[PDB]
Structure formats: structure tokens, C-alpha cells
Design a protein around this ligand. Structure first.
Ligand SMILES: Nc1ncnc2c1ncn2[C@@H]1O[C@H](COP(=O)(O)OP(=O)(O)OP(=O)(O)O)[C@@H](O)[C@H]1O
Ligand SMILES: [Mg+2]
Lengths: 57, 49, 189, 114, 171, 117, 50, 114
């Protein structure tokens, strides 16, 4: 029973091995894109505020 | 699964740190954009006056 | 000069009407042809499945599955339209056929022509290249009988009769409405 | 032919024949494109376009506008070039190869460039 | 001494100014243009005329060579770059930088839908953060090698922090 | 019950369920009803197919050199050309059966067999 | 002139006659007005050579 | 986009684009039938039908005939209504609901009536 269980465990293990390695790059790219998006949103809202102060003044 | 785990943790931590760096650079750029637009607003108000 | 200009205006208007009608008719026939392409897909899928099974059980020694030890002749079935007004269709197909001929000659094989559609016959006749056998009158609306005839001819030429040590089919893949591409598939071996 | 020689006259008149045939097809080219023409006329249209663009030359007076130095083509070279081009020996090169190139050596150089 | 032929066909479809690059020309120009503009926009007129000619061929051709596609993309990006609002005259150095973006290929990674915004945002960033480039262009009328390298570095840095309208990165 | 898909090279002619199928493979006649072992068998050049529908009378089909196949989920009959018995022209089949060509005679004989001859 | 297209493809030098030609409502008076407006950066210099 | 508001220009240009596509598809509709269109084209045709019929209005000049008092739709209301139309927020109403109505209030009332 334990032998079969170990087979199964090592299987899921190498599965996660390929996976987690793929997901590391995937999540790094995801967080990097989110950071770029927050940066762009900050620049865009700052530009909007600048144009708003231009309009108001 | 230990290393992949180590690599994923390192990727998350490095992504968070470099995202903080990206956001700091973007905040500085936002500040400079706001300063430029405020200076332009002042110049336009001066010309209108 | 004004009379000539007005006559040309009338001529161009008539041509515009005819071309617009042809465009709409082609729009209808594109849907018809795509529906007919999809209608044949189940047969192809099922016959491919059982052919895979038989190959799994077969000896895999049929002549269609083994290359000739010294290949000399490679038949080419160039599928082309039988009527004009198709833009670069025929030009693309025949340019790809010429590319295939150059590839064959660089590899030491001699291409022999089988042609479908009158435009390809004209193109090859102008270039003094002979065609063993050619069919016409069904590129606008093919039927399985014509495909059966072409396949019988090609297979018999492959079994041979001077015969051919290879055979390719050069035709236009209908990848999408916006794009079509001239391709060549080695149909045997 | 009595003044410029037989070869020059023959080349010039063959070029004119090709260009006139190209002009005669202008309406069909404009409407349906070169695709509808017969092969004997499609080849002629291709080499007619190549002859028309090869008659262009990078004039020395044009340096101030484009920056390329101007080229001078001796008569023998142009006669030979157009004799070759009308016969179709260059109809495998792209059209842009002949555009503002001014000679056979420059033609091959620019064909390599493309 | 030359004509700027504004075409109604281009004007009515968003291309404003509607300069017909094929027919429009300046005989006496070239000598009057400053050195930096002559360097960056040396072949811009010929490139745009060739792209306009090629657009008709590619408007219906199913496919074209790699050169044809590259020329079509470059010409589309250049046309979007030259598109300009009204009563918004750019100084000569800003023009130099904007044309440098396109003629040197830096826009090839930016989609057509965002060339205008990319150019405007980069000009804002260069004025706010790297005015040394504009100062050099204005003062010496030439885009020096060091200035060109700094501008390329700034363009690459900015393309990291820019979104296409589709959300994808433009690097 | 069987899921019988009768497919012509031009179209998917018929895909209704059936309780039983009958046809002459080249090696003999075969009668198939559900859970039959997986099979593939060429039909005789003049063969005809019977499908006993769960509803009304069984359909008789003239088939031109088709390949029958059976798998736990479906029963396929891949045919160059297939005609329902109601679509058969008796005079045309009679004329074809008298034709000298082997293929034409086989097709006419198949049509006659499907019709009821 | 302050316009990217004209200052890049068809530069206008001082002493030149540059014909702005086009149909009605093609932006001819918006290219000459922009040129006039763009001269203010030179005007404020106070240098008659500019 | 200077004399009229930017939102006004965007809405007007979107409506013009939709109507232009609809007029381009008129040729396919009147010959090959409406069924031949794709799902996107069918959606755009329904939207264009509703936009085009919504440009109609119960003109005051018609009050003499029907007795219904004419409608004056403020510019803002027109802009918002056509922004909704181009966005498809009213694509589920019958076409007859858009005939001869001034503004979204009359649109809703006629929708309820139908
Ligand atoms: N670059 C531009 N971007 C956007 N709109 C523009 C641009 N240039 C001009 N326009 C618009 O073009 C409209 C008409 O152009 P303009 O008045 O300059 O043309 P024109 O040649 O002087 O016309 P005309 O003499 O026939 O009245 C102007 O209202 C302006 O809104
Ligand atoms: Mg005007």
C-alpha cells in the first residue's frame, strides 16, 4: 500500500515540480505587469490632475 | 519541490521588491509630470493675465 | 474628348455593377464552399481513425508507405481555378508549384505535371511544360467523382507505364476569410 | 538605324513596343490588375514595369534633393542593359532593384542589397 | 519653390495635416532644415510615399514578402506619428525627437493604436526628466552621438513602463 | 441502443440511433446490435445496408463500396455515395446493372438490392 | 512651421515660397496660422536675426 | 472636437461609423438575405437599424396632423442617448419603439406601450 502511495506522491511531486517552476515565472511576469500598470495609472492620474489644475487656474 | 518552492518564493519576493522600485520610479515621474503641468498652468495664467 | 470621357464613364459604371454582382455572388459561394468543406470533415476524420487502426494492425509495407530506392519522377497535382477574376489565386498556386519544382530539381527529382483548372493549363502551356493528364470544369463546385478520378490517376501513376516515384499536391489552403495560402503536401509516399 | 546603328535602334524600338503595349493595357491593369492578362502579356507587363523603372536614373543634379551621388551610364552599357532586359534576362529581379540605379553594375549591386 | 499639397481624401479620414507626401515637396528645403532633422528625417518623404503606394497593393493582396510587411508597418506608424492636433506647434527639438522615434524603428514595438499617445507621453517625459536632449538639440542644432545614445536609453526605459491599448507591453 | 452514423464523403447523411444493423461485408454478412466488439469491414461493391430503427420500419440504403465500423459508442458506415431506398430510380438501376463497366454494374445491382429486387 | 509633417518632409526655409495647396476644408489656414503662432518663441528672443 | 464637446464628437463619429457599416452591408442584406451575416454583423445591423430610426423625431411641424406636441431634445440628452445606443443598451427594444420619439423619456414610454 505504501509503495503505491509513494508512487502516487512522487508523481504529484514531479507534477508540481514542472508546475511550480512554470508558475514562478508566470507569477513574476504577472506581478511585474501589475506593477507597470499601477505605474502607468499613477502617471496617467497625475497627468489628469495636472491638466485639471491647468484648466482650473 | 523544495527548490521549485524556493524559486517561487524568491520570484514572489523579487517581484514585490522590483515592483516597489517600479512604483517609486513611477511616483517620481508622476511628481515631475505634475510639476511640469503646474508650471505650464502658471505660464498660461501669466499669459492670460 | 468629352464624348470619349462620357463613354468611358458609362463603361466603368457597367464594369462596377458587374464586379459588385460578382463580389456578392462570390460572398454567397464562399459560404456554400465552406459549408461543403465542413460537411466532408466527419468522413475524413472517421476514415483517418480506422486507417490509423488498420496501420496499427497492418504490415506497413504498402507501396504508398515506402519510398522508391532511387526516386526520379515526382508527379505534381496543381489545383487551379477554371475561370478568371480570382486575383492572385492562380498566380499564388503556380508560384508555389514552381517553388516545389525547384525544390524537387535541387533534390535530383524530375517533376511531371497533373493539372486541375484551365488557368494552370494555360500557364504551363506558355512555358512549354507538358501535362500528363488534366481535368477541368469543377474547381468552382467539385464533386467526389472528380476527386475519385484524380486519386485513381495519381495512385496508378505511383504504382507504375513510366510512373512516378513521388507525388505532391499543390493547392490553396482556405485558412480563413481574410487569408488563403498556397501549400504543397506530399500525398505519397 | 542609319545614324545610331542597328543595335541601338532595335533596342530602343523594342523598349518602345513593350512600353506601348503596357500603355494599351492601362485600363485593364487599373480595374482587374495584372492577374487577368494572358501570360504572353503578363510577362510583357512585368518587364515593361522593369524597363520603365530602369529608365530612371540618379541624376547628378538630383543630389541636392535626395543625397545619392549621380551616376553616368555610357551608351554601350545602356544598349546592352536594355537588350538584356527586353529579352527577359532580368525579369527575376524585384522591381525596386532597377529604380534610380543607373547601370548594370549598380543594378546587380542593388539587387544584392535587396 | 515647393508645395504642401493637402488632400481632402486624407483629411476627411483623420490624417490631419493631410499632407500628400507623394506630390508634396520642397525644392529649396534640405539646405534650410537643421542638421538633426535632416539626419532623422532623411528618407521620411520617400519612405512615406512608398508606403502609400504599397498600401493599395497590400489592401487586397492575401500576403506579401517580409519587406512589404515591414514597410507597411513602418509607414503606418510614421503616418500616425506625423498626425498632429491644431494650434499645438511643436518646437524643432521636439519634432527631432518625435521623428527619431519613428524613423529609427523604436515605434515598431508600439501598436498603431498607441503611436500618438506613446510619442506624446515620451515627449512629456523627456521635457520633465531628460531635458538635456532638448537643450543639446536646440543649442547645437545637431543630435550628437552621446545625446542619441541617451535618447535611445530613455526610449527603451520608457517602453518598459508603457501600456498598449490592448494591455500588452511594448518592449 | 446503437448510435448509427451513416456518412457519405460529401455529407453526414444519417446519425439516428438504431437497435440493429445488417450488411454484407466482403467476408460475409454481419448483424450488429449494441455492445458488439469493435470492428471494421469493407462492404461488398454492391452491398446494401439495413438499419432497424427503434421507431418505424427499418431503413434500407444502397451503399457504394462503403466501410462498416463498430465501436462501443457508434456504428459508422463510411460510403462514397449512399441513397435511401425511397430515392432509388428503378429504371436507372436496371440500366446500370446492364452496363458493361464493373463499377456501374455493381452500383446498379446495389440500388436494385436496396430497392427490393 | 511647428508642424511635424511639413518641418520634416517639406522644410520651409526663410526666403522660400511654399505653396499650401488643397481643396476646401483641408486645413490650409490651420497650417499657416500654426506657422505664425510658432514664431513667438523667436519673437520673445528680441533678436532681429531671429 | 473643439467647437463641440469631445464626448459629442466621439458619439457622433461612432454613430456615423455604425451607419456607414450598415450601408455597406445593405448590398449583402438585399441580395443574400439577412441570414447570411455573421453574428457580429447581425448585432451591428440591429444596432444601426435602431440608431437610424432613432434619428427620427416627432417634429413640431407634424403637430398639425397628429396633435402630438413636438419634442425638443437637449443636446446632452441626445449625446447620452446615442452613447447608450452605440453601446447596445437599447438593442433589446423593438425597432418600432424608436420611430418618432424625442429623447429617452419618450423612448421608455413607447417601449412600455409596446
Ligand atoms: N491638424 C488638425 N487636426 C484636427 N482638426 C484640424 C486640423 N487642421 C485643421 N483642422 C480642422 O479643419 C477645419 C477646417 O480647416 P481649415 O479652416 O484650416 O481649412 P481651410 O483650407 O482654411 O478652409 P477654407 O478656406 O475652405 O475655409 C478647422 O475647423 C479645424 O477644426
Ligand atoms: Mg481657409
Amino acid at each position: 500500500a505504501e509503495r503505491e502511495a509513494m508512487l502516487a506522491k512522487t508523481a504529484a511531486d514531479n507534477r508540481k515540480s514542472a508546475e511550480q517552476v512554470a508558475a514562478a515565472q508566470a507569477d513574476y511576469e504577472k506581478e511585474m505587469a501589475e506593477a507597470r500598470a499601477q505605474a502607468s495609472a499613477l502617471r496617467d492620474e497625475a497627468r489628469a490632475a495636472g491638466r485639471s489644475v491647468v484648466d482650473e487656474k | 519541490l523544495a527548490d521549485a518552492d524556493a524559486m517561487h518564493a524568491k520570484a514572489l519576493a523579487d517581484a514585490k521588491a522590483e515592483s516597489e522600485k517600479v512604483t517609486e520610479e513611477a511616483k517620481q515621474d508622476s511628481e515631475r509630470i505634475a510639476a511640469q503641468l503646474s508650471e505650464q498652468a502658471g505660464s498660461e495664467a501669466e499669459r492670460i493675465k | 474628348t468629352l464624348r470619349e470621357l462620357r463613354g468611358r464613364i458609362r463603361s466603368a459604371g457597367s464594369i462596377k455593377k458587374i464586379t459588385k454582382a460578382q463580389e456578392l455572388i462570390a460572398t454567397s459561394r464562399i459560404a456554400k464552399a465552406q459549408a461543403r468543406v465542413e460537411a466532408a470533415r466527419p468522413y475524413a476524420a472517421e476514415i483517418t481513425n480506422m486507417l490509423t487502426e488498420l496501420a496499427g494492425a497492418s504490415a506497413l509495407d504498402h507501396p504508398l508507405l515506402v519510398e522508391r530506392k532511387q526516386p526520379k519522377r515526382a508527379g505534381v497535382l496543381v489545383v487551379s481555378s477554371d475561370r478568371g477574376l480570382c486575383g492572385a489565386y492562380n498566380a499564388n498556386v503556380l508560384r508555389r508549384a514552381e517553388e516545389l519544382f525547384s525544390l524537387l530539381r535541387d533534390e535530383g527529382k524530375d517533376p511531371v505535371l497533373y493539372v486541375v483548372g484551365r488557368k494552370a493549363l494555360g500557364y504551363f502551356s506558355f512555358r512549354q511544360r507538358t501535362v500528363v493528364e488534366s481535368w477541368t470544369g469543377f474547381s468552382e463546385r467539385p464533386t467526389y467523382e472528380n476527386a475519385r478520378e484524380i486519386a485513381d490517376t495519381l495512385v496508378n501513376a505511383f504504382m507504375a507505364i513510366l510512373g512516378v516515384d513521388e507525388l505532391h499536391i499543390v493547392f490553396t489552403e482556405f485558412r480563413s476569410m481574410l487569408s488563403q495560402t498556397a501549400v504543397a503536401r506530399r500525398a505519397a509516399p | 538605324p542609319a545614324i545610331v546603328g542597328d543595335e541601338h535602334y532595335r533596342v530602343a524600338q523594342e523598349v518602345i513596343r513593350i512600353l506601348q503595349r503596357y500603355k494599351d493595357l492601362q485600363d485593364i491593369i487599373a480595374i482587374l490588375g495584372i492577374d487577368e492578362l494572358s501570360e504572353e502579356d503578363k510577362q510583357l507587363v512585368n518587364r515593361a514595369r522593369r524597363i520603365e523603372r530602369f529608365l530612371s536614373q540618379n541624376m547628378m543634379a538630383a543630389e541636392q534633393f535626395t543625397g545619392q551621388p549621380g551616376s553616368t551610364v555610357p551608351l554601350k552599357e545602356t544598349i546592352e542593359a536594355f537588350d538584356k532586359l527586353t529579352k527577359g534576362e532580368f525579369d527575376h529581379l524585384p522591381e525596386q532593384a532597377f529604380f534610380l540605379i543607373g547601370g548594370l553594375d549598380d543594378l546587380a549591386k542593388k539587387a544584392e542589397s535587396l | 519653390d515647393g508645395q504642401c499639397f493637402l488632400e481632402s481624401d486624407l483629411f476627411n479620414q483623420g490624417v490631419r495635416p493631410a499632407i500628400n507626401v507623394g506630390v508634396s515637396v520642397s525644392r529649396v528645403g534640405g539646405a534650410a532644415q537643421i542638421k538633426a532633422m535632416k539626419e532623422v528625417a532623411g528618407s521620411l518623404r520617400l519612405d512615406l510615399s512608398q508606403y502609400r503606394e504599397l498600401e493599395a497593393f497590400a489592401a487586397f493582396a492575401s500576403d506579401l514578402d517580409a519587406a512589404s510587411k515591414a514597410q507597411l508597418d513602418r509607414g503606418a506608424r510614421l503616418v500616425e506619428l506625423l498626425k498632429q492636433p491644431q494650434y499645438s506647434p511643436l518646437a524643432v527639438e521636439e519634432q527631432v525627437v518625435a521623428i527619431f522615434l519613428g524613423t529609427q524603428g523604436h515605434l515598431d514595438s508600439v501598436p498603431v493604436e498607441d503611436v500618438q499617445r506613446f510619442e506624446s507621453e515620451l515627449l512629456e517625459h523627456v521635457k520633465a526628466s531628460h531635458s538635456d536632449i532638448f537643450d543639446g538639440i536646440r543649442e547645437t542644432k545637431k543630435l550628437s552621438e552621446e545625446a542619441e545614445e541617451k535618447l535611445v536609453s530613455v526610449i527603451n526605459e520608457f517602453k518598459k513602463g508603457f501600456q498598449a491599448s490592448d494591455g500588452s507591453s511594448v518592449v | 441502443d446503437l448510435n448509427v452514423e451513416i456518412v457519405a464523403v460529401e455529407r453526414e447523411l444519417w446519425s439516428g440511433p438504431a437497435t440493429f444493423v445488417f450488411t454484407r461485408t466482403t467476408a460475409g454478412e454481419i448483424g450488429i446490435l449494441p455492445r458488439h466488439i469493435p470492428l471494421v469491414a469493407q462492404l461488398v461493391d454492391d452491398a446494401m445496408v439495413r438499419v432497424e430503427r427503434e421507431g418505424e420500419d427499418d431503413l434500407r440504403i444502397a451503399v457504394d463500396g462503403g466501410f462498416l465500423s463498430v465501436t462501443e459508442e457508434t456504428v459508422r458506415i463510411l460510403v462514397e455515395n449512399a441513397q435511401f431506398e425511397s430515392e432509388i430510380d428503378a429504371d436507372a438501376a436496371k440500366e446500370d446493372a446492364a452496363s458493361d463497366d464493373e463499377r456501374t454494374a455493381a452500383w446498379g445491382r446495389a440500388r436494385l438490392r436496396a430497392l427490393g429486387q | 512651421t511647428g508642424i511635424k509633417a511639413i518641418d520634416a518632409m517639406t522644410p520651409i526655409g526663410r526666403g522660400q515660397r511654399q505653396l499650401i495647396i488643397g481643396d476646401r476644408k483641408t486645413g490650409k489656414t490651420a497650417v499657416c496660422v500654426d506657422t505664425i503662432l510658432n514664431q513667438r518663441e523667436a519673437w520673445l528672443t528680441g533678436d532681429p536675426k531671429q
